[PDB]
Assembly symmetry: D2
Amino acid sequence: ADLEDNMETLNDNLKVIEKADNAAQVKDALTKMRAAALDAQKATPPKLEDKSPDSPEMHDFDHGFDILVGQIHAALHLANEGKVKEAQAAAEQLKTTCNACHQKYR
Amino acid sequence: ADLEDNMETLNDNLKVIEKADNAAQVKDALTKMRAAALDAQKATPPKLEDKSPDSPEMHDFDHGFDILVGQIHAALHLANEGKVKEAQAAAEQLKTTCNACHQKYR
Amino acid sequence: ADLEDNMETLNDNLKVIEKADNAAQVKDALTKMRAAALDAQKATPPKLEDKSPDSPEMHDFDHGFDILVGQIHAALHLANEGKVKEAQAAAEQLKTTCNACHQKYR
Amino acid sequence: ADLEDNMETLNDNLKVIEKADNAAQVKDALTKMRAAALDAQKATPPKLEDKSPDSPEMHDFDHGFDILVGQIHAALHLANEGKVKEAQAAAEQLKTTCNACHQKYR
Ligand code: HEM
Ligand code: HEM
Ligand code: HEM
Ligand code: HEM
Ligand SMILES: [Ca+2]
Ligand SMILES: [Ca+2]
Ligand SMILES: [Ca+2]
Ligand SMILES: [Ca+2]
Ligand SMILES: [Ca+2]
Ligand SMILES: [Zn+2]
Ligand SMILES: [Zn+2]
Ligand SMILES: [Zn+2]
Ligand SMILES: [Zn+2]
């Protein structure tokens, strides 16, 4: 899918995690986010489409998804350990990653 | 896409890179590899379909792709610096990652 | 420094971030957290002293540190952008990583 | 030790790895390179001494070590599996990383 739909799936599952009851739903949510993140990591934001694929700006953009993906990785460990509250706290915290990139390249 | 189709993409582009005349071709092939690895990374291999998403094997499987994507990342740096030869040698080098994963999960 | 002392440095600055009032203070503490983290990453914990330095356990142990440093790195971004509270929430959040390794390897 | 001592250690073990006759010798050499790389990663290079601690230059400097450490990580896996020739090829290939950072900051 394209950034749009991946960002959508990404955003949706954040709400799923926030309203999740058990670990399986959060785990399931994070997994879907992981998939959306990895798929979107190969796209080029409309504001950098005129920038070199490997310019200072694009390397930062790519770096951004790496951060998010790492945050989703750590979150999964928590959810896997049955730590639902900690996992939801990590989902909220990684929200800064979402915002930071948007401020820069959205 | 099916795990094998991504593997086919990975395999062919290794050839494209080896036969490349210029930086443009190595980068193009490297970027397609990045995309294939990332899609591959979301898949559940036949030999591990019985395991849980949270298991030493699946965590190791995921790690293998982080290794590959990171190597593709380094290769891309050399290519965007004009070092066509070094980028080609890097693609040759990461073949070891391909073999290492296969010996365990293929 | 040794593993044990770097851990102290880590815990002390975590409290500095908690009591911090400006971005300057948080950046400095995080900076120190990264150095003590990178420094401690080379060590072998007493719980795994007698075990292949290439064992599954040492690999997992090292992974835990990557997660920690990875989190400190993102927290540093926030701090560098002048987002005190956002960075403070990141320091809080990564406590979960400290916890996870301790229960398993300390 | 300082940046300079860590760089010497990196260079020595590169030579050890080249002449190594077995897997144990290579693992030992890579392990030392790992510690030296991580030790150096915390240092501010003379050429970046007047830059702000969180400037693009320092972020790029840090990224370079991440790459080097990742390459050592992959090489260790090779060595750990007894693939001596492959690990040595890995060590020689990462020399491109040594080069790239030197070109920019040495
Ligand atoms: C969990 C975190 C994230 C969430 C929940 C999220 C959510 C969204 C949403 C809902 C949109 C609007 C899509 C639309 O216009 O239909 C969007 C757009 C966008 N996001 Fe994110 N995002 C996240 C992280 C990121 C990150 C880390 C980056 C950059 C590295 C990023 C870059 C963008 C860009 C460039 C757009 C505009 C895409 C376009 O206009 O086609 N996002 N995001
Ligand atoms: C760039 C390096 C790589 C190349 C060139 C490559 C190439 C291939 C090829 C040609 C196949 C057979 C596809 C088929 O039967 O249709 C294959 C299978 C496979 N590869 Fe890779 N691969 C690479 C990296 C990896 C990595 C890093 C992993 C694991 C972390 C991996 C896991 C697998 C698995 C599990 C299969 C078996 C799939 C099945 O039997 O359905 N490969 N790969
Ligand atoms: C920011 C997070 C962390 C903090 C604040 C922290 C803090 C500490 C502190 C203060 C101690 C001393 C315990 C005592 O008084 O007996 C300690 C010991 C230890 N920590 Fe951590 N730690 C953190 C993360 C980690 C991680 C990520 C790992 C593993 C990857 C880890 C592994 C250990 C081990 C193995 C010891 C025992 C060392 C010894 O007694 O020889 N810690 N940690
Ligand atoms: C295996 C790879 C590497 C080897 C073999 C290596 C080797 C060396 C050597 C022999 C020196 C000269 C030491 C001296 O003058 O006392 C040096 C200097 C330096 N290296 Fe590396 N290096 C490697 C990787 C890197 C990387 C990845 C970076 C940056 C990300 C880097 C940054 C520097 C800097 C900044 C200096 C200047 C030190 C000074 O003059 O104070 N090196 N390196
Ligand atoms: Ca199949
Ligand atoms: Ca073909
Ligand atoms: Ca093309
Ligand atoms: Ca002490
Ligand atoms: Ca010198
Ligand atoms: Zn993990
Ligand atoms: Zn890079
Ligand atoms: Zn960064
Ligand atoms: Zn590994």
